[PDB]
């Protein structure tokens, strides 16, 4: 089980990033995948996750307040990619960004941020003044 | 008049990047605005244009299918999407503006007059 | 010829970070090496640099206005690495380090810009507010 | 009385950070100041502390195994400000570290923390 992060890097305000997130053998399709991100000093916080429920039906997609408008998260099942579009970059947005997944293949909006388990090396993501 | 280029860095190749040139006082809507890049050691070569009956847009064969310009004519800002960065597209960005007359003439590279100051793209292996 | 940069990462400021870059084959104990830097959108600048004087009689190490007091640079002939302690980091040492080294000595002219051919691939050094 | 601590981040293994406690009123200097560090899932435990011995005639550092020879403690009595340089950082040293006071159930005052993260 891994997951390599890309598509980071330096930006200006207001520039755009796009990040990927390949996944080696688990079967991508039925898990519930997520970004995270940690500030210098800081906690680790949830950004965005997208995932299934059987209990509705369908996908269930997330964003916090402050990525709110501006992040897209989107899958590939076919390529077993996640990405992360990063439009409009402000400089609180400045973290090391992970690549998460959660593995009991049903949660959808009582995904708790405990249910991540599976984990990625990261990608530093850094927006200047 | 100024010109001001934001939104360049630096990213690995594969990468995405957007820039954005905002415009301060001279009709916007009425010019032909058009991106540069110099490369080190090269000289200053065009990128795509778009503006001026009906619009044109034109892009580099090197930018084919991976750039996008755009214009906002109401905040007076031109974009530049670039997708898929390459270790080729590293440069120093720059954003021109010509006038268009004619009508039947074209918008040759000589005919941007007014330029910025720049922003650096780096596109690392 | 491979030079390899670590030791980077995220700090909030007045913290402090430890830069270290190792040598492929090239015969370091001969080459002035030096710290490179770019922030996103600006032109590539030089840091702090050491090595060969002018005069085949002396070492001399270069440290640049911004960094002055601050960063300290220093070479292991023995080991083949090169050293940047950055103390007391401001938000505006955010940049890619690069780690370069030049080979032209010309008795009686000194170190250039220019004259730095092999590179690295960098490391990212993110000051936070 | 307020402890605020800086100087945290991300690291890659064998990196190295710095963190920074300025201390608000007053004690400083007759006071034992400390470094704790907890992680994740995991109780506090203490890291080292420097100050005062029994009887005045001198001061006491400590530094626990898991950090000795690669961390260093050091105070700034005029500044109010307690240091900690951490040099050769490993990943079990991700924690966050808190920033504490006495004068290790004798530690009373105590700051909120700084995140340090060292990944493979």
């Known amino acids: 089980?891994?997951?390599?992060?890309?598509?980071?890097?330096?930006?200006?305000?207001?520039?755009?990033?796009?990040?990927?997130?390949?996944?080696?053998?688990?079967?991508?399709?039925?898990?519930?995948?997520?970004?995270?991100?940690?500030?210098?000093?800081?906690?680790?916080?949830?950004?965005?996750?997208?995932?299934?429920?059987?209990?509705?039906?369908?996908?269930?997609?997330?964003?916090?307040?402050?990525?709110?408008?501006?992040?897209?998260?989107?899958?590939?099942?076919?390529?077993?990619?996640?990405?992360?579009?990063?439009?409009?970059?402000?400089?609180?947005?400045?973290?090391?960004?992970?690549?998460?997944?959660?593995?009991?293949?049903?949660?959808?909006?009582?995904?708790?941020?405990?249910?991540?388990?599976?984990?990625?090396?990261?990608?530093?993501?850094?927006?200047?003044? | 008049v100024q010109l001001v280029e934001s939104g360049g860095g630096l990213v690995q190749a594969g990468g995405s990047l957007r820039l954005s040139c905002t415009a301060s006082?001279?009709?916007?809507?009425?010019?032909?605005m058009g991106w540069f890049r110099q490369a080190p050691g090269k000289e200053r070569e065009g990128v795509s244009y778009?503006?001026?009956?009906?619009?044109?847009?034109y892009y580099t064969d090197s930018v084919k299918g991976r750039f996008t310009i755009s214009r906002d004519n109401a905040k007076n800002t031109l974009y530049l999407q670039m997708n898929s960065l390459k270790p080729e597209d590293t440069a120093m960005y720059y954003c021109?503006?010509?006038?268009?007359?004619?009508?039947?003439?074209?918008?040759?590279?000589?005919?941007?007059?007014?330029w910025g100051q720049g922003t650096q793209v780096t596109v690392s292996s | 010829?491979?030079?390899?940069?670590?030791?980077?990462?995220?700090?909030?400021?007045?913290?402090?970070?430890?830069?270290?870059?190792?040598?492929?084959?090239?015969?370091?104990?001969?080459?002035?090496?030096?710290?490179?830097?770019?922030?996103?959108?600006?032109?590539?600048?030089?840091?702090?640099?050491?090595?060969?004087?002018?005069?085949?009689?002396?070492?001399?190490?270069?440290?640049?206005?911004?960094?002055?007091?601050?960063?300290?640079?220093?070479?292991?002939?023995?080991?083949?690495?090169?050293?940047?302690?950055?103390?007391?980091?401001?938000?505006?040492?955010?940049?890619?380090?690069?780690?370069?080294?030049?080979?032209?000595?010309?008795?009686?002219?000194?170190?250039?810009?220019?004259?730095?051919?092999?590179?690295?691939?960098?490391?990212?050094?993110?000051?936070?507010? | 009385?307020?402890?605020?601590?800086?100087?945290?981040?991300?690291?890659?293994?064998?990196?190295?950070?710095?963190?920074?406690?300025?201390?608000?009123?007053?004690?400083?200097?007759?006071?034992?100041?400390?470094?704790?560090?907890?992680?994740?899932?995991?109780?506090?435990?203490?890291?080292?502390?420097?100050?005062?011995?029994?009887?005045?005639?001198?001061?006491?550092?400590?530094?626990?195994?898991?950090?000795?020879?690669?961390?260093?403690?050091?105070?700034?009595?005029?500044?109010?400000?307690?240091?900690?340089?951490?040099?050769?950082?490993?990943?079990?040293?991700?924690?966050?570290?808190?920033?504490?006071?006495?004068?290790?159930?004798?530690?009373?005052?105590?700051?909120?923390?700084?995140?340090?993260?060292?990944?493979?």
């Open positions: 778009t503006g001026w009956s009906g619009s044109t847009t």
């Open positions: 006082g001279f009709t916007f809507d009425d010019y032909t």
């Open positions: 021109a503006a010509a006038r268009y007359r004619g009508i039947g003439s074209q918008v040759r590279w000589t005919d941007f007059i007014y």
